[PDB]
């Protein structure tokens, strides 16, 4: 079984010499296959024209609170709530 | 110093000592009815030795209100033992039959754990 030696997205796995792998001989280990890091870097950054942009989660009242991100600094600016990346050319 | 308070069932130390001796007499009479009824694994002599130890660990107090509060609480346990009002799990709580004893020397306390 490979779920015992599988690593979660928080970087946790039990060692081979650990006694705590004896709890998994009768119940399988639950490791989430959808890591949030890979699915947030799969989303491409959004190119914007304005100096500041607003983010609200993409759902309105069902997203995160609306925050404003400055884009005058070059590079990719990451929203601290949802992880969407904005960029200004 | 000095303080004027309302008393509890006794004015001086002699009446409180008489009430403590009345507790010892009533608990002595109540022990053989405790043993035959409660289904506990304790001999009558072990019960009387435990009663003596319970009085010995409260010999050290001197204040008459503390002594009379102890008399009131012991009378409550006596009334909870004349009527059965209890189970065998609570009678054996005086002996502490489930707690494994811990060592008192510093080397064994150092080896076992920080407590």
């Amino acid at each position: 079984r490979g779920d015992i030696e599988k690593v979660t997205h928080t970087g946790q796995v039990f060692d081979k010499e650990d006694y705590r792998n004896a709890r998994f001989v009768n119940a399988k280990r639950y490791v989430n296959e959808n890591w949030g890091i890979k699915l947030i870097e799969e989303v491409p950054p959004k190119e914007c024209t304005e100096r500041v942009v607003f983010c609200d989660g993409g759902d309105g009242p069902l997203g995160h609170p609306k925050v404003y991100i400055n884009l005058d600094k070059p590079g990719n600016h990451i929203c601290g709530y949802c992880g969407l990346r904005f960029v200004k050319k | 110093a000095v303080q004027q308070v309302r008393p509890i069932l006794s004015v001086d130390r002699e009446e409180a000592r008489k009430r403590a001796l009345n507790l010892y007499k009533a608990w002595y009479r109540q022990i053989p009815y405790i043993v035959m009824d409660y289904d506990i694994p304790m001999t009558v002599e072990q019960c009387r030795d435990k009663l003596r130890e319970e009085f010995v660990k409260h010999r050290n107090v001197t204040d008459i209100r503390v002594i009379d509060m102890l008399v009131i609480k012991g009378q409550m346990e006596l009334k909870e033992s004349v009527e059965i009002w209890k189970q065998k799990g609570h009678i054996m709580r005086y002996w502490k039959e489930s707690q494994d004893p811990k060592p008192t020397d510093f080397l064994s306390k150092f080896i076992q754990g920080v407590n």
Binding site: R20 | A1, V2, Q3, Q4, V5, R6, P7, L9, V11, D12, K57, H58, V61, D63, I64, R65, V66, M69, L70, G113, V114, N115
Partner: protein, 151 residues
């Protein structure tokens, strides 16, 4: 007094019963130093082992407010916490590790600890206030090193 029916449990009582009721209605002389360790129901191990700290709580250095500083409090010495092997919480065998008791003066907490028989100690006394002069004219001064370079 009144010419009505008298109380039957006082008229028919023995002289020893009238003396017993009047002695309990009086005031006895007791010492004010009273140890209440066997009455409080605390186990004796926590009486002989735990140390009690009376302290004014520390001000949060990130916050200018001093309302939570305005009381004294009793807290108990921190014992061993550990990780349970199942799931990773902070198990603790100390029942008194979570109790902070509020008090007005350290003398009240000292008398309370002498009442309950705890082994008490005071970490620090009341903080004296130093008179510091603050006004806006020191920031713009002539031949002084306290002239500010900001603003």
């Amino acid at each position: 007094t009144d010419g009505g029916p008298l109380d039957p449990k006082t008229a028919l009582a023995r002289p020893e019963e009238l003396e017993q009721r009047n002695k309990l209605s009086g005031k006895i002389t007791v010492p004010t130093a009273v140890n209440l360790s066997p009455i409080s129901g605390v186990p004796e191990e926590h009486i002989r082992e735990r140390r009690v700290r009376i302290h004014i709580p520390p001000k949060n250095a990130m916050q200018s407010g001093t309302d939570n500083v305005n009381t004294w409090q009793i807290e108990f010495d921190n014992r061993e916490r550990w990780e349970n092997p199942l799931m990773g919480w902070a198990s603790s065998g100390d029942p008194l590790s979570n109790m902070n008791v509020q008090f007005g003066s350290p003398e009240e907490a000292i008398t309370f600890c002498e009442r309950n028989g705890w082994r008490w100690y005071v970490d620090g006394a009341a903080k004296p206030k130093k008179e510091r002069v603050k006004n806006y004219g020191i920031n713009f001064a002539w031949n002084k090193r306290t002239r500010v370079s900001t603003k």
